Symmetry: C2
Subunit: 295 residues, 2 copies
């Protein structure tokens, strides 16, 4: 029982995944906006001035939903689900955007556009390949993810004069029950009254959506399906009592009609919850593997 066990150790292998939280990527007024980063990095290497990991990886940006501020956006909560994506050969960032109590749309899009450009511009120090960028979000984050895909090159949505020498285009979009058409949301049952001036959608645009239709359409992904777009993955539970399942059906049919590469899954018996079971996460993993090509 005085026996010491012995085991070997593989040399020259990246196996430490480091969480780097609270990276400030922009500052509007006195409000700094942050992102959290996950990357293959052994923290001992920086501490002892050793040559770090030289590999570059495709990037996945995660946009946590929050009703654009209906609740305070929690960019840390989903991080444990992002860790296995690093293992597939990605860098992952979870990005904060401003709530509608701070500024109305397109401020939220300005924020995530700027985060994309920040991550591309500073790519080398984060082991990022800036040419391969996917974005993934749930509910209001899925809404913004769609807009990153569908509003590429629209100058009024770029935001501040920061990192303008890189593009804010993304190469793949994964949408978990994201709002699609603000004016059609109240057509189907929900626990929210989405037409109320106090709804998350009305606050997003600064007025009751049915009474402010130009601004409601400006903030709707459905308004941009005629534009060029990267491949899009849509997933939505048929029991979702927050974002009607028909929002995603409407998006999917409009994208197909326009000739877009779109994939949609109906999650039977699922509601307004992240699709964090293994077989549903595999769909997201397969989608980004196809279009971002880790390895």
């Amino acid at each position: 029982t005085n026996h010491i066990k012995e085991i070997n150790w593989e040399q020259n292998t990246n196996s430490y995944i480091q969480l780097i939280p609270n990276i400030e990527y922009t500052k509007v007024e006195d409000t700094s906006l942050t992102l959290h980063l996950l990357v293959y990095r052994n923290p001992m290497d920086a501490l002892f001035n050793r040559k770090g990991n030289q590999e570059t990886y495709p990037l996945i940006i995660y946009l946590q939903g929050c009703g654009w501020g209906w609740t305070k956006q929690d960019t840390s909560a989903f991080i444990p689900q992002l860790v296995p994506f690093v293992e597939q050969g990605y860098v992952v960032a979870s990005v904060q955007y401003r709530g509608s109590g701070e500024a109305v749309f397109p401020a939220q899009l300005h924020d995530v556009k700027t985060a994309v450009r920040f991550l591309k511009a500073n790519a080398a120090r984060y082991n990022i390949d800036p040419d391969r960028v996917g974005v993934w979000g749930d509910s209001s984050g899925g809404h913004l993810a769609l807009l990153l895909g569908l509003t590429e090159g629209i100058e009024e949505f770029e935001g501040p004069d920061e990192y303008r020498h890189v593009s804010s285009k993304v190469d793949a979009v994964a949408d978990w029950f994201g709002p699609v058409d603000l004016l059609s949301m109240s057509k189907y049952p929900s626990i929210f009254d989405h037409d109320s001036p106090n709804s998350p959608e009305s606050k997003l645009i600064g007025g009751a959506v049915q009474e402010n239709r130009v601004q409601a359409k400006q903030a709707s992904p459905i308004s941009y399906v005629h534009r060029e777009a990267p491949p899009i993955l849509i997933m939505h539970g048929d029991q979702d009592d927050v974002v009607p399942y028909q929002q995603s059906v409407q998006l999917f049919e409009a994208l197909i009609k326009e000739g877009h590469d779109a994939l949609m899954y109906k999650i039977n018996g699922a509601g307004h919850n992240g699709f964090t079971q293994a077989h549903t996460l595999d769909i997201v993993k397969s989608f980004f593997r196809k279009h971002l090509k880790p390895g």
Copy 2:
């Protein structure tokens, strides 16, 4: 042929692991000390007043090493390696302790003892089973994990008058190349002069270790191996140029001599780096499964 595809969803299944960061567990002066928590929790549930997770899980506390403040402790860095532990049926917390530049030993032990009591006292809020607590640390964090296992019942090491109605005992200790005997560190090669007044060890206790042998011994896990101890896991690389490998051998042989349940792995060809490869993390997982028994219903008899 591009139709909506259907896939099924399992009900009554926990699959969301939530990271809950920056939980303040104590405050000294105006210095707030925090921990990060990982737990099976779907954040939608609290947001919409749904039934939440009512299971309790054994707790693993991780103590990130930092030379006791030789560098600023980073309690977030290791978080991705702790996530798969939650999937095995634990709650995991990564705990901040003060640097020696703020306070000398036993301040660091006061901090992590108070973290144990805080987590036990607030266990219901975090799905924790307070009767099954393991602790795991690397380098100076492994040093503190050993002291948690070995110094139970010593009032001088409890810290502030906070949550003193619960005990700071732990039930299993995992030690990654933690310093063991501050006075014997310099007996073997290292890129530090651990006897220097500027060494992390000397700053920990407030002076050059060989001149302050009383405080150095009080701060050394080796001084407590005769006391009652939980099961202990020790892992150390034989190329470690920061903490001499023979520190862990010295600890292991002394634990065995006292009749304790000790397990040690020499990691051949590894140095002073976390053992984050799958086959070495599995050893930690097997150790905590054996002694904390996740997935088993647990009562106190």
